[PDB]
């Protein structure tokens, strides 16, 4: 009966922000709590209680939603696979590489950290071109690196004797599955400064700079369980929620517009991080009427 | 007691560096360079630890600071891979692990003005500016001792804004307060050891923010010198020497 | 078997529900966790890092010349150097800061700010400046006698080449919305102006113009709430 004590502590306790102490005036020499040296590389140690006369505030504002868990544990689109079986693509299946860097919202949040180590939850929202969800049966097979990749809707790899597969219909709640940390290294790496293989990297197209196979986690194979062309195209949307996050080496957030997945390539028309004023003195605030 | 002295002496190996106008010494991420503990090791071969031969100060490059100067960047293991007994233990072994103590030197008269930003960026992936043509050349990714002049320092040639580079371990060489920057950086990687030829752990960046201004009659040639020193260098996986 | 009754909210995919899904790999033990330096567990720890403010974001100023507040020897007295607003999530100088980009991932902020100034001039250049924080209600001060009435520091150049202006938390409400403009100027923070308390004096054979580097950050009592998406970067097609 020691779990009743554990079940009570299963709530988000509030951790409050810092308090302010009351301050008085200081008229003396040799005590300069406002002069700093930014060349040191350290941020300013100056506090409010030493620059102005402050009051006592008992701050009760919470700081929990600023954790890296809460900031990241939120689903987001990481892929859109289109299973085509109509027109000039009578395939019935798609093999999609697992890359979470194809959509700007999840990408910019992840590229805040250099190394991340997390478990994940993957939800699949599949439908047709008109938002409709008939009772078509679909198989969502996961093909780890080295496993054989399907070549038709009716090929032996769909037997999923060892690969994880999920059978679901479009007319059912979105399939959801917990994925562990699956990298040979001890953490994923959104920025790899190097090359995968040794050699003289004197090629015209240096397509291998930055590619770390520790993040290449394989393919997702999706088929309609059918025996011929269904004539209907199915869109699948992959949402990745990050759980048990550990992040290292913060980085500047992206300022330029992305151009290509897997590369930090930007454009020659460099945009400005800040918008433009008319002068270094103009501010956009027309307050009250001055008394004088 | 609670201040930072301006005189500093940095002695590792058979090298000593003196400075009389130092600001402080940045201990990146609060951690000192260390050897690989057995709890966090994967290779079974006994590592080589050349203590005084490898861990020492190497003066490697001097760049001429000018008014119209963008900046320069070096990649850390690449800058020292053809020099001394470091550039031989790193060519004979497949695995390598080391920190460093970067020291940047720029002195000028009290009638000169200007400020440099010296930062150490883990996993500094250089991007290309597209109108091949979409990927950087090997000269711009691993430039060696003679580093690479920046093309767009505003974006650090990586798409990231320069204003936020202060999130990395950094220092300033402001020509009215100091003339050297010192950054001690531990080994940062998602793997205990890694190749010193195919992977650059850190990027060393020196960018002028406030350009170098002087008056007529002053010394027009103000050089910036980069001195680096490995700390706690280990090597494993001996084989034929490879230079890539 | 056991009688149950389904309730509303069944079959819904709430993108922020901390639930439990089935594991796709039974018996999986991942790679061991080794010590990587530089672990950060809170975004507020990043907001307290000083980053460069883009105060010279005027039209025609390109590149790193936007991170520089020009300071110069003056012919007249009591003149204005530069101004900017202290709303962290407003289009302006605070877009270049880490506290200004983390703020845009949240809806409301609270706590004191910190704008550290650094004088990158000659050793022989002396001067004194009056940096003033004008609380909400008033427009940008038209004179130094008006700005003097607010939270201000006088800054003497010297050996220690940096000064810290703590923008204190003077607010009607416990929180301010990151959005600003229109009705949301109810949450305006104020205006920081830099005046010349004295002149910028230099000896002969010394440059008469220098720069000031602004470094904005957050204090120990900074907080954020109502996590949201950002208006920073856009996309029109999948990167492929």
């Amino acid at each position: 009966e020691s779990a009743v004590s554990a079940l009570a502590d299963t709530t988000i306790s509030r951790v409050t922000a810092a308090n302010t102490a009351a301050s008085t005036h200081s008229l003396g020499t040799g005590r300069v709590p406002a002069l700093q040296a930014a060349e040191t590389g350290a941020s300013s140690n100056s506090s409010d209680e030493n620059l102005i006369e402050t009051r006592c505030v008992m701050n009760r504002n919470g700081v929990n939603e600023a954790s890296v868990e809460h900031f990241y544990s939120r689903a987001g689109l990481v892929g859109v696979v289109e299973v085509k079986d109509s027109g000039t693509s009578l395939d019935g299946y798609t093999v999609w590489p697992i890359d979470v860097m194809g959509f700007v919202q999840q990408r910019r949040k992840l590229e805040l950290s250099t190394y991340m180590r997390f478990d994940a939850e993957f939800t699949f929202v599949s439908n047709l071109n008109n938002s409709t969800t008939p009772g078509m049966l679909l198989q969502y097979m996961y093909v780890p690196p080295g496993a054989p990749k399907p070549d038709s809707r009716k090929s032996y790899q769909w037997q999923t004797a060892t690969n994880p597969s999920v059978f679901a219909k479009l007319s059912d709640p979105p399939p959801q599955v917990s994925v562990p940390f699956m990298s040979p290294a001890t953490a994923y790496q959104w920025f790899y400064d190097g090359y995968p293989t040794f050699g003289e990297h004197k090629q015209a197209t240096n397509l291998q700079y930055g590619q770390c196979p520790n993040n290449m986690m394989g393919h997702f194979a999706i088929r309609t369980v059918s025996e011929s062309t269904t004539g209907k195209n199915i869109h699948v949307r992959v949402y990745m929620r990050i759980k048990h996050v550990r992040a290292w080496v913060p980085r500047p957030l992206r300022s330029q517009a992305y151009m290509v997945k897997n590369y930090p390539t930007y454009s020659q028309t460099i945009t400005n991080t800040a918008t433009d004023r008319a002068s270094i003195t103009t501010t956009d605030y027309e307050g009250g009427v001055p008394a004088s | 007691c609670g201040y930072s002295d301006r005189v500093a002496q940095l002695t590792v190996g058979n090298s000593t560096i003196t400075t009389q106008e130092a600001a402080n010494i940045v201990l990146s991420y609060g951690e000192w360079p260390e050897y690989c503990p057995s709890t966090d090791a994967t290779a079974v071969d006994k590592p080589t630890r050349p203590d005084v031969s490898v861990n020492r100060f190497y003066t490697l490059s001097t760049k001429s600071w000018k008014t119209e100067s963008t900046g320069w960047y070096w990649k850390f293991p690449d800058v020292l891979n053809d020099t001394g007994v470091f550039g031989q233990n790193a060519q004979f072994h497949y695995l390598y692990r080391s920190g460093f103590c970067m020291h940047v030197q720029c002195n000028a008269s009290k009638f000169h003005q200007g400020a440099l930003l010296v930062a150490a960026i883990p996993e500094f992936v250089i991007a290309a500016s597209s109108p091949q043509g979409l990927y950087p050349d090997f000269a711009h990714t691993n430039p060696g001792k003679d580093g690479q002049e920046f093309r767009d320092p505003y974006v650090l040639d990586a798409g990231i804004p320069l204003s936020q580079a202060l999130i990395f371990p950094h220092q300033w060489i402001n020509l009215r307060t100091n003339n050297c920057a010192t950054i001690i950086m531990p080994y940062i990687n998602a793997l205990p050891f890694d190749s010193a030829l195919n992977h650059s752990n850190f990027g060393l960046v020196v960018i002028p923010i406030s350009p170098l201004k002087y008056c007529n009659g002053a010394t027009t040639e103000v050089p910036i010198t980069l001195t680096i020193a490995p700390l706690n260098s280990e090597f494993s996986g001996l084989r034929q020497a490879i230079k890539q | 078997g056991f009688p149950t009754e389904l309730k509303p909210g069944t079959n819904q995919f709430l993108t922020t529900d901390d639930g439990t899904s089935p594991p796709i790999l039974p018996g999986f033990e991942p790679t061991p966790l080794i010590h990587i330096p530089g672990e950060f567990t809170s975004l507020l720890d990043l907001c307290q890092v000083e980053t460069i403010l883009e105060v010279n974001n005027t039209t025609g100023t390109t590149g790193v010349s936007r991170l520089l507040i020009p300071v110069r020897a003056q012919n007249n007295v009591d003149q204005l150097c530069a101004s900017f607003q202290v709303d962290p999530g407003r289009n302006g100088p605070w877009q270049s800061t880490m506290v200004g980009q983390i703020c845009r991932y949240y809806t409301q902020w609270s706590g004191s700010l910190k704008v550290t100034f650094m004088f990158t001039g000659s050793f022989m250049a002396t001067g004194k400046m009056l940096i003033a924080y004008t609380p909400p209600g008033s427009a940008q001060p038209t004179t130094r006698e008006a700005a003097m009435l607010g939270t201000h520091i006088v800054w003497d150049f010297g050996l220690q080449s940096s000064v810290t202006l703590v923008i204190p938390w003077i607010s009607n409400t416990h929180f301010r919305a990151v959005k600003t403009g229109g009705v949301y100027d109810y949450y305006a923070t104020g205006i920081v102006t830099i005046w010349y308390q004295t002149n910028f004096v230099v000896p002969p054979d010394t440059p008469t113009e220098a720069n000031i580097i602004a470094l904005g950050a957050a204090q120990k009592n900074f907080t954020l709430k109502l996590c949201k998406d950002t208006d920073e970067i856009q996309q029109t097609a999948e990167y492929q």
Partner: antibody, heavy 124, light 107 residues
Framework: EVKLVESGGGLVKPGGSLKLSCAAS????????MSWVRQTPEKRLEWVAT????????YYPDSVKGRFTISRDNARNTLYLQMSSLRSEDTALYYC?????????????????WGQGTSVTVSS | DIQMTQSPSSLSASLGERVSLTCRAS??????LNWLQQEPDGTIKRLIY???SLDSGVPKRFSGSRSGSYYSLTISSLESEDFVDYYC?????????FGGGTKLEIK
């Protein structure tokens, strides 16, 4: 005192070449961006060239881009303008002035101290 | 190219009056409009820079301002050596363009 002395004018035949130097004195020539300016006989000024304070960066308007080249000698404190195949549309008075878009501390000396004015004439 | 248009090509006055010369821009140029003065011999000197700052050594009779897209240079009290020529230079775009002269004469 800042003094710029341009020299090298003359009457060059159509489709030729001409070099226009500009002796600088009284200031640190290695810290300022310089630029050349034209003045059509119609009393209409025009930008022709600009160069960085070190000589790496150059910008030419489309009316001049491809023909003229602007050099810089900092040890001798001289500024050059090497012309190429010319036309009657280039007969004007050329001025050497300070200013350039390749300086982070610019925008203050932009066209602050002009020269005296040479005179080129393209005709037969 | 940012075409800049000076409104008066010529303005007559008498010693002591107050004249003003405007110069409008085709796009946003900010506080990057300068003013020049060409003497009869052919020397150019910069009077006002950034539309509101007078060059060190210029009389207090010159005053620059901005009212919308119109950038104006005002001569409060005209003296004798103020009847030569005036140009506006913009340096916000890359093709730095100049005005078209505002030669002031006497009556």
């Amino acid at each position: 005192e800042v003094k710029l002395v341009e020299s090298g004018g003359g009457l060059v035949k159509p489709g030729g070449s001409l070099k226009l130097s500009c002796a600088a004195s009284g200031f640190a020539f290695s810290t300022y961006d310089m630029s050349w300016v034209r003045q059509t006989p119609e009393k209409r000024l025009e930008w022709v060239a600009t160069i960085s304070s070190g000589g790496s960066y150059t910008y030419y308007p489309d009316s001049v881009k491809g023909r003229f080249t602007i050099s810089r000698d900092n040890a001798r404190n001289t500024l050059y303008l090497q012309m190429s195949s010319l036309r009657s549309e280039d007969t004007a008075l050329y001025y050497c002035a300070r200013g350039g878009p390749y300086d982070y501390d610019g925008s203050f000396y932009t066209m602050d101290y002009w020269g005296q004015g040479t005179s080129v004439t393209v005709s037969s | 190219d940012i075409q800049m248009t000076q409104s008066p090509s010529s303005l007559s006055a008498s010693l002591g009056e107050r004249v003003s010369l405007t110069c409008r821009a085709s796009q946003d140029i900010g506080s990057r409009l300068n003013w020049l003065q060409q003497e009869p011999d052919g020397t150019i000197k910069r009077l006002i820079y950034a539309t509101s700052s007078l060059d060190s050594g210029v009389p207090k009779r010159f005053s620059g301002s901005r009212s919308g897209s119109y950038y104006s240079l005002t001569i409060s009290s005209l003296e004798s050596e103020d009847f030569v020529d005036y140009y506006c230079l913009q340096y916000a775009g890359f093709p730095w363009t100049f005005g078209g002269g505002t030669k002031l004469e006497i009556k």
